[PDB]
Design a protein around this ligand. Structure first.
Ligand SMILES: *[C@@H]1O[C@H](CO)[C@@H](O)[C@H](O)[C@H]1NC(C)=O
Ligand SMILES: *[C@@H]1O[C@H](CO)[C@@H](O)[C@H](O)[C@H]1NC(C)=O
Lengths: 565, 565
């Protein structure tokens, strides 16, 4: 296979684990915001310039697929042009030059070095070691091309706030690009590539190793530290804009990077073209660089949107990277190894979800929020999600073991999974009712007795498919019916409730909206399989939601500020 | 060879280059002392515990030479006991428990992880990869053994400043050891070694890699940052004590570590015993850990001595590591590859010295100190030292080229080298005269015409030995006579002047004292070779001084605070 896709989850755990470390450290005041600057200045002024310089010196320019680069740079210029033009059309005249400066940079500047590189190394170091080169090519050339334009727009905003001297405006944009270590150490590294015939001098090599190898962990930790307190409650428009920009960064850009490789890489080998198109997609899924938030702070422009969006982009990239890489690998796999891949995916996701759930439960418990409404109902949801994650980790082994194990593990897994769907409905209707002593005892048995009864209907009616690798087909058609019926109910309850619409109702709405979308995908898998490789893709998205929805619960209620005892 | 000794200078440039980066960054206020804490807390609470945990899990305890460990730990316990007892005998009663707490820790706690490990990796990774294990063994066990004793003495000092509750005093010592990440992540890592059958779980492995690999550069940079402003002018007694403690750390300890391996490693293989004895020596040359300065700050005891001493130990370790490793390699080398080794050494030292000289010159020039006395005479010294370093880098190639090159390069090299000796004398006598318009024009031609005349006496009288790899024998006996005569003069002038004893006279005295010792070694090489492998060792120490004395000039006047234009 072109991607060593099994190596990705370890690498994402490196990436987002060290981010989580930096985040916890900042949230705990292990490292204060002023202390974080020493890590940041180490990272940006020493560890990164050394990493760039070494990799630029080593780089074999006569063995670079320039068409891949052109493809990514054209995709970024396309996304930049779109977001810029739409901002100039859509935004208010008082701020459209700051927005059309920074929003296009947000949509195109990737976290290439801290997050992209360890992931690309994990995926490709053993199969396409040349793919690692293009991170050190794309990211700087991307800045050199696109950031002076965005900085010109911010300088126009600065002039408008004070466009008379055009060449001063252009020069201040270009100068702010030249003053970026990413740009000047790439110029210097290219020079020394040609001065040294690509050989790092042996005396300097280990110094550059020590600094460069300290970049990754140090930058990921600093990223975590700079994520602390940055999500601030945005107006509806600022939130819609942020969703659109993260979509530009994490959906529009990877789709164009893929398409541009397919237009402009005229190379012969289908496997190399495939893997390169896949790599282009993955390159697009990298989050927004923290540098963009730095530019926003330096210009004092769009700061909340850019900082929030960078943080959220980072969080959201983790599942999208994982999901995309597997989805891109699936058409190469044979049908059975694809089932095994989906159970692997499910196990991996079960672990992050389980841990994020155990944390979120501990917060809801120790904060005593679990006694308040709708937080009690939210706790029931997360218990169900936790049981789903444990049940999936158990199924990963019990899929080889006897029926007496499988039936129990399935009953666990699908009672609790159906419960997660039902609780999405029950939560949403409670938000309507709170927006009236809601009938908590009835709502609780509705979220727990009813799914146990529905699984009972499977033990009563269903055909036991113990040969199946995927528990989603363990009771066959009857399971798909039972699952669909559960989802049909919970989506109608949830949607009609949101239509009918501290207590945190807006965050519970956000939780329900995202969980609804996961229910809706699952409904689609059930109804698509009932009525009829796009199905197996959708089945994987269902697995991803089913075992990873605890991570959504964590992303909204795990990261709450309340603490106790 | 047992040490890949050619890899050491690259590794020392990694080590002390990243320290120099951290130092420059702090001195420039790129990173303020409060900002440095974020790097320090990353290093101590995340990067180091990950490094320790991974290496502890991986460690094959059934393949550890426990006798090596015992040897190092017995050497450290010996040095600890000596320094402790001598402090309890020699020190004043009001502070002897703080001194007998921290001085023995200073003499025994090595910078094992930030400096020792990359150096041991460089020397041994390809020949004795098992030698890397013992850093993760010795350093924690050393803390566990020895630091609670020193902390007990500091707690006795704390009680005396306020020994009634003995077990509280013992417990506070042990608790401060347990609260060290080095100790608890070693306990945890050993546990998980035995839980996981030495296999890091694959999901966790890359996370531990990212953090652990960020330790080295990050810790070396933080070390540099914490060296800023820490050398504060000590009383004569505090200075003598500091010299004695750095000698305990960097001479007494490596000699005992060597001897203890030779007493307690009863292993059969002479090459393995040799390399292990050499490794034990090198392990002893690691500087004082910054942790010791942290304990001093936490106890508020002996802070200046411990911090200054840790900084100076770090600086002084660099040459001692280099010099020792080569000296320990020399008895394995054949006589000719030993000559080539000495020219390699000379080249390496010429580079660090040359750069440190170019810096120190630029400071003395731009500060305009070069117009003041004795700083003018100090500038003449450093010009001569710079020419020596360039001349040696040229000789490294011209030793293969024709006599017309060699004679010119030698004339350069030995006029300027003799000038460095003469300038040591001329500087010292000027310190006496300043402690009287000193006859600067005469002193200048004395430092420059006289050595050119003496080299002329070589071009007049000497036999040209163009086959010689070492320029110290290029004009044979006549050169050794000329060199000796130069040294005999300059040592008598210098010594009689110091006996007869901003303007910085105390620092110029320190410069003269150290340069005198280098002259004295060189005199010994000349007179020993004139009158008669200990000679080749001494000849190497002469090369080391001759090409590295610029680094002494830098260590005293390069790191001055004055700046301009
Ligand atoms: C894909 O590219 C690699 C690297 O140049 C090359 O070795 C390989 O043969 C290519 N594959 C095919 C089938 O052309
Ligand atoms: C030295 O130790 C290594 C590691 O156990 C071993 O392989 C080697 O044979 C030893 N050398 C001799 C000569 O015993």
């Amino acid at each position: 296979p072109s991607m060593s896709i099994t190596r990705l989850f370890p690498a994402l755990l490196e990436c987002f684990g060290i981010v989580l470390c930096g985040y916890i450290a900042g949230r705990a005041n292990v490292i204060t915001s002023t202390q974080a600057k020493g890590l940041g200045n180490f990272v940006s002024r020493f560890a990164l310039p050394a990493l760039l310089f070494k990799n630029m010196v080593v780089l074999n320019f006569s063995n670079v697929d320039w068409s891949f680069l052109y493809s990514i740079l054209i995709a970024k210029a396309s996304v930049f042009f779109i977001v810029c033009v739409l901002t100039l059309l859509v935004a208010s005249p008082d701020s459209r030059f700051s927005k059309a400066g920074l929003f296009p940079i947000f949509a195109t500047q990737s976290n290439d070095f801290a997050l992209g590189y360890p992931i690309v190394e994990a995926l490709y170091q053993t199969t396409y070691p040349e793919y690692l080169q293009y991170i050190y090519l794309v990211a700087p050339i991307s800045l050199m091309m696109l950031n002076p334009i965005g900085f010109i727009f911010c300088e126009i905003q600065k002039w408008k706030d004070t466009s008379q001297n055009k060449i001063k405006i252009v020069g201040l944009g270009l100068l702010r690009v030249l003053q970026n270590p990413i740009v000047f150490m790439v110029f210097i590294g290219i020079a020394f590539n040609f001065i040294l015939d690509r050989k790092v001098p042996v005396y300097v090599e280990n110094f550059l190793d020590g600094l460069g190898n300290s970049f990754s962990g140090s930058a990921l930790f600093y990223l975590g530290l700079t994520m602390v307190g940055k999500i601030k409650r945005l107006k509806k428009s600022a939130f819609v804009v942020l969703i659109l920009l993260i979509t530009a960064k994490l959906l529009v850009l990877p789709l164009l990077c893929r398409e541009m490789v397919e237009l402009l890489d005229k190379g012969d080998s289908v496997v190399n073209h495939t893997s390169l198109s896949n790599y282009a997609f993955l390159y697009g899924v990298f989050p927004v660089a923290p540098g963009v938030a730095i530019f926003a702070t330096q210009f004092n422009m769009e700061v909340e949107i850019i900082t929030s969006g960078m943080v959220i982009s980072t969080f959201v990239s983790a599942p999208i990277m994982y999901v995309s890489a597997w989805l891109l690998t699936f058409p190469t796999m044979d049908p059975k190894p694809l089932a095994y891949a989906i159970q692997n995916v499910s196990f991996d996701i079960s672990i992050v979800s389980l841990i994020s759930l155990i944390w979120s439960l501990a917060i809801l418990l120790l904060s005593k929020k679990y006694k308040q409404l709708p937080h009690m109902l939210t706790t029931n949801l997360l218990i169900a999600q936790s049981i789903v994650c444990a049940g999936m980790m158990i199924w990963n082994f019990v899929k080889e073991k006897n029926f007496v194990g499988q039936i129990l593990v399935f009953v666990l897994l699908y009672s609790s999974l159906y419960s997660t769907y039902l609780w999405t409905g029950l939560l949403a209707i409670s938000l309507f009712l709170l927006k009236v002593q809601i009938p908590v005892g009835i709502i609780i048995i509705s979220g727990w007795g009813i799914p146990a009864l529905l699984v009972g209907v499977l033990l009563i009616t269903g055909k036991h498919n113990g040969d199946s690798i995927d528990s989603a087909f363990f009771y066959g058609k009857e399971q798909m019916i039972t699952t669909a019926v559960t989802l049909f109910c919970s989506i109608l309850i949830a949607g009609i409730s949101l239509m009918c619409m501290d207590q945190q109702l807006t965050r519970h709405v956000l939780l329900c909206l995202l969980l609804i979308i996961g229910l809706f995908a699952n409904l689609s898998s059930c109804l698509w399989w009932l009525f009829n490789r796009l199905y197996v893709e959708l089945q994987f998205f269902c697995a991803v939601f089913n075992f990873g929805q605890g991570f959504i619960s964590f992303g909204i209620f795990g990261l709450d500020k309340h603490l106790i005892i």
